[PDB]
Homo-oligomer: 223 residues x 7
């Protein structure tokens, strides 16, 4: 039986990364060779549980990545927002995503840290502008000024191509101790919101000055 | 017994995703073929525990999603609020929900991150408006002005269709060092709160100017 | 023994949600049919541990719910406060609770997220009002004014029915660089605190104006 | 052996909450009746691990409660502070504690959420009052004024019974750009701190006015 | 064998807190008495794992306590700082520590919540005082004033006994838009820092007034 | 069999860090020598599980490090940003990374604490400058001033070598109650952003003074 | 066999901290003495798992400590920064580190709470000083003043020995609504940054006064 067991073990070892495989092979051999390694199994299992609780991140991350990819949630060149960060995606790997912030940095984010993320290149983009006007100014006057500003904006051929449909004037949307707030909304081609917002702000300043609408002004009273 | 064991193993393997299934088959074979793989079982179990702690998120998320669906908590097109985000739901998948923020973004939120979420399309919508008035102004005067404003609002046929029942005047609801606060409440058709609030603010500004109620004013004293 | 084992397995399978039950049955059969599925057990156990770490939330939540119910902590129609949210409870399910915020929203909160929650419909409700008065004003004068205000309040038959017992004047309760603070306390029927607070604030403004008590006023000094 | 095994199983089942006990009995029977339920054991163990990770809270909470009780840390009627909450304890159960906030609410806190909690009814209560005085005022003048205020306080027979020992004047305790801060300390009967603090603040205002000590005053300089 | 097994079980049970011990005894008996309780073992193990995840806190806390005690980190009567709390230690138990805040409260903190804690009664105590002086004042003038203040302080026999060695004048330590900051440092007997700081602040006010050093003053400019 | 077992155990022990290996050897010996150490296995397994939950950090950290290295995410001498810290990398070990803050400190960060980190030496660096201008100033005037400033900047031969391509003027990008904001963008050689930003700010101040553009100015109104 | 088993158990027990060892010995004896303690094993294993989840901290902490020691990250007498704390290291034990804050306290921090820590005694120390100057002042004038200040500083023989190399003037580094900021950088012997910074601030005040550079001044406009 001795020679037979020896031959059996030989055949098995012949049938049998590399260092751990070698340790496991040594374990199976010592097991089959007249030794019952329960506590050696215990030590190797402690080591394996350690590496497990360690090497969990890679797999969690790659599966989160492939899931995000299934939903078509992020492509190369999009403008995404991940937590407190907003930038352009420059490259995606099987572990992490590369986001190029506007301040020049190059953030690397591993998928596990990505729970909820916003994308700016899906369909439409909107603009919600709010402007303040001194509480004492005439409401209709300022509102007509804002309407004239938007109308002049929509005449700019270069910008008109960026707005989908018609503007949406909401009128007054709130009062403060000093000012009331006008609001105008849009619906633009994706990723072009900010250009529209900037042109609108320029036109709004110009026309508020023309129509003589005053900016909000803090008020005091003495004695 | 050798040929018999061989035939048994053959039949079993014949009776026997793909790569892991193949590894498990190799394991059962080496087990039945004169080898006791306890530590090989240990390594494969470490790998499996890793993938487990990894692939937990998908199932947790899908069950959270189906639960949220059971309570009729979220449909396509509703206006929901999830954590620090408020927007419209554009599409729901078996892993995540698509929320369209007003700023044009397209957030993707996986159900696991959704613990508590608010919905604005269930039943009724309310309005609680607060306005400030200088501490020195006559209380009854300002309150009557606000009542006249609300009364003129309720005469606007377009808005009246949005208010359920009658307004609820609360009177003064608090004093500051400079101003006391009036409050009026409503109960409106769902999702129409903001239109009512805006019309009310416009009317309130107009009538506060007519009745000559002053806005709050900071007060100083020199020497 | 072959036919006998076959008959045994048949009887067992005859004696034997649905898909997992079928997989378990296949497992017991392959086990009894000349195969020792230790690693198949390992894979199925990984899957089961995954679903376990997943389907834990439902049971945790239902037991937390039934516990909260045992303590009579929340009923339909009460006005509760859960974390940063305050509203009315509209309906309770075996997984979550429906809270109707005052802003019209309809929050859904699962019991697991509920650790500590306040309820406003248990027994009594109290009012602790603080008012500011310019540092230079006479203490006794302002205090007597506040006492007269409370006295006139207690004469309002409609409100008197809401106050339990007698008011509790505390006198000055703190000094600032500009103002000292008066305080008056109450004990009211449940859920009626705010009506009392509002009536009290109205009366306090009126009587502070009558008695000529000044509001706090920031003070400066030049050069 | 068949009839013998049947009789054995019968006797065992005869020797044998209710639904789980029934499932366990079915398990032991199928085990003893010619079936080896390893994977059925696996499914039942997954379910049990789920309920375990679920029903952990009740026991954790009751043991935390009995521990808090061992240290005599909280009784009915005491004034405790738990996290961001301060109120009176109205009733204690085997799972949670009932705290009555001053604003009328009735918080329910489960012991698990209680890590560190303060109690105001153990032994003594102290008072540390700080008052501000304009930087230009004479130090000795203001300090003597405060001493006279405390002296008049200690003459009030109703309050004297609440102060243990003698006051402790610390003198100036800090400078700002505008004011220096005086401080006086006490040691009072438990739960009576606030009454003493309020009486002291009243006397301090009165005597600061008598002695003509000015409150702090912001200072500017033009051009 | 029946009578023999019965006698064996009897002897064992004879050889055999109380309720759990009884359940375990019942388990060993049913085990030895012709029943293989694997799933009963599973249920009892679920219960035991629950109590384990529950009764972990007591032992964790007592070992953390004995460790803190080994380092001589906290004694009865010391003035410690634990998280956001600062007070005197009144008594220590095998689970928690009793800290007496200055505001009269009596906090109970269990050792587990104590990660990092400061102690004020180990060796020496230091004082780092910063004072502000208007940007336009002469540097040497104010510095000499502060030196004279410290010199007069060191002449107070009662205080001199509390300062170890010599003061350490650092000169200017920073500029603001309005003021530059002088700094003086000390090294005092333990627990006596605040008395020294207060005496120093008194002397500093007196000597800044004598030498005519102005406090910082906000500056404006009109039109 | 006694002598045979003895010889077997001897051979095994002959075939058989050091202290734990010795304990495991003692375990296997006592196991093979007529003793079944199940509870000794339990104690050793508790100890091993402890060390496992302890020695997990080293391996997790080294694998996170080698992963970060695979993505070429951090080299010696780069300027990285890790959480709230921004500095230069001075040396990398198999456990942690050494970051040299600008304030002279030498932070040591272990890879586990590194989830998302930014790098400033990958490709390009950008500049987004915003400047404020009083609301009343002429828009075209200030914009032309800023254009002249940038033009003079691009004439500086030393700086021109640092800017890639052409500046990008966005015009007005927002209104406040007091000021509107101009914006100019760049794209520079990596790590040279700040030099460009500083030169640009100098030129902008000079040219805003030349063209007489006023800085924003708070506005008041009395009575 | 009875006497033989008795002798075997005797020999084993003869071959066989103290209380747990005794319980384990009792377990092995009852095991070998005709009893199969599976559920007793279960209870002892629950207790052991409890102590494990408890006594994990000591080992985690000691290994974190020895790791920090391997990287030469902290010695006796260094000036380190750990989280929100900055002080001198007074002594290190096998569990915790003793940090002496400047305010006299003596913090004890266990290594587990130390994730990222800064050290100020490794190599070099730097200084980055920023000063504000009124927006209307001449840029070249203020910059030349700052250069003269630094030049006079470098003439102080006592300080010159602390600066490595040459100062680095950056010019303007930013504009505000009221002030532009000058910046000068250094590179000093370790731990000597603050002395240099203080001397520099003194010289800067003196020379800004000489050259007549004004501090920033808030600006207003009335009506």
């Amino acid at each position: 039986x001795x020679x037979x067991x020896x031959x059996x073990x030989x055949x098995x070892x012949x049938x049998x990364l590399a260092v751990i495989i070698s340790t496991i092979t040594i374990m199976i051999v010592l097991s089959e060779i007249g030794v019952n390694i329960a506590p050696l199994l215990a030590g190797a299992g402690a080591l394996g549980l350690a590496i497990s609780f360690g090497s969990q991140t890679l797999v969690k991350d790659i599966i989160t990545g492939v899931f995000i990819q299934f939903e078509n949630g992020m492509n190369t060149g999009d403008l995404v927002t991940i937590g407190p960060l907003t930038g352009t995606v420059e490259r995606m790997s099987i572990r992490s995503v590369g986001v190029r912030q506007d301040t020049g940095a190059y953030h690397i984010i591993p998928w596990s840290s990505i729970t909820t993320f916003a994308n700016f290149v899906r369909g439409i983009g909107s603009v919600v502008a709010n402007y303040d006007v001194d509480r004492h100014e005439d409401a209709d006057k300022a509102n007509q000024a804002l309407k004239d500003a938007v109308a002049e904006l929509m005449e700019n051929e270069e910008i008109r191509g960026l707005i989908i449909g018609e503007p949406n004037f909401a009128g007054i949307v709130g009062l403060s101790n000093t000012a009331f707030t006008l609001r105008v909304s849009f619906t633009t081609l994706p990723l072009k919101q900010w250009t529209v917002r900037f042109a609108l702000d320029s036109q709004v300043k110009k026309h508020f000055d023309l129509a003589g609408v005053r900016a909000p002004v803090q008020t005091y009273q003495v004695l």
